[PDB]
């Protein structure tokens, strides 16, 4: 039988993904065979901030889904005092698998996806929130199209530093134009293979790199030309000089057609 409720419904689980410690995720499939996820985190061990970020992640991404079918859909959830049951579209795979998998991203591909990501991004951004960790696993290909599964809000399920912005790292001691950096360091990832400082493998190094001025980032010339520009702007190291995710709306590479 194997049954899981969720205010009232039974769901019937078929493997945990990701995540196995602290918070679980789960394919399921439910009445009508239809095939779902089923996040679950146990509150018998968060603080109160835990549990007040996962309660804010919650309100914003079910106010946000009518604003956007670019972000993951929750179909219903129960809240408790001990336990949190998201019901969520099911993952096809996500935008970092299927990366590091094959090797040879079509252009138009290439292109399309990141259309998904700067919907979704800038969707976020309109009602004030910054992910602030945006990373190819925070993406998840559904029918093609990509879609933002979460809101950096909650602490939800290693540990790269290669998307990180300069301006992050220099303040140690938020803004938008912090999610243009690591959208850009996905882009470029999917334009060379490769992040921005991903050869620099002492780690203390990355971060000496990323924030030198004189750390002329490489951009390989290529035919694309608009996409070469994207990734420049995307990568300035002044997020006052960044272009922003407006702008990139506007830009070439997004609005000029050629299949």
Same mark, same amino acid.
């Given at each position: ?22 918070s ?28 007040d ?15 956007? #079918?670019?972000?993951?859909? @929750?179909? !219903?959830?129960? /809240?408790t005092? =001990?336990?949190?049951?998201? &019901? ?14 094959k ?30 960790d ?8 559904? #029918?093609?199209?990509?879609? @933002?599964? !979460?809101?950096? /809000?909650?602490? =939800?399920?290693?540990?790269? &530093? ?38 620099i ?42 272009i ?16």
């Amino acid at each position: 039988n194997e049954c899981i409720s969720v205010k009232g419904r039974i769901y019937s689980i078929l493997k945990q993904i990701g995540s196995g410690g602290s918070s679980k995720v789960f394919q399921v499939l439910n009445e009508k065979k239809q095939i779902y996820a089923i996040k679950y985190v146990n509150l018998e061990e968060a603080d109160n901030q835990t549990l007040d970020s996962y309660r804010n992640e919650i309100a914003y991404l079910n106010k946000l889904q009518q604003h956007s #079918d670019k972000i993951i859909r @929750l179909y !219903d959830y129960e /809240i408790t005092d =001990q336990y949190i049951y998201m &019901v969520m579209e099911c993952g096809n795979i996500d935008l970092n698998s299927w990366l590091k998998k094959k090797k040879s991203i079509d252009p138009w591909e290439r292109k399309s996806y990141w259309k998904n990501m700067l919907e979704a991004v800038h969707t976020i951004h309109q009602h004030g929130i910054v992910h602030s960790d945006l990373k190819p696993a925070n993406f998840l290909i559904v #029918d093609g199209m990509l879609k @933002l599964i !979460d809101f950096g /809000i909650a602490n =939800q399920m290693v540990g790269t &530093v290669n998307y990180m912005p300069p301006e992050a790292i220099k303040d140690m001691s938020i803004s938008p134009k912090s999610d243009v950096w690591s959208l850009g360091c996905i882009l470029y990832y999917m334009t060379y293979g490769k992040t921005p400082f991903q050869q620099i493998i002492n780690q203390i190094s990355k971060l000496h790199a990323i924030i030198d001025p004189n750390h002329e980032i490489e951009f390989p010339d290529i035919p694309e030309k608009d996409l070469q520009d994207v990734l420049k702007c995307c990568l300035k190291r002044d997020p006052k000089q960044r272009i922003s995710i407006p702008e990139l709306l506007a830009h070439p590479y997004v609005q000029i057609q050629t299949h």
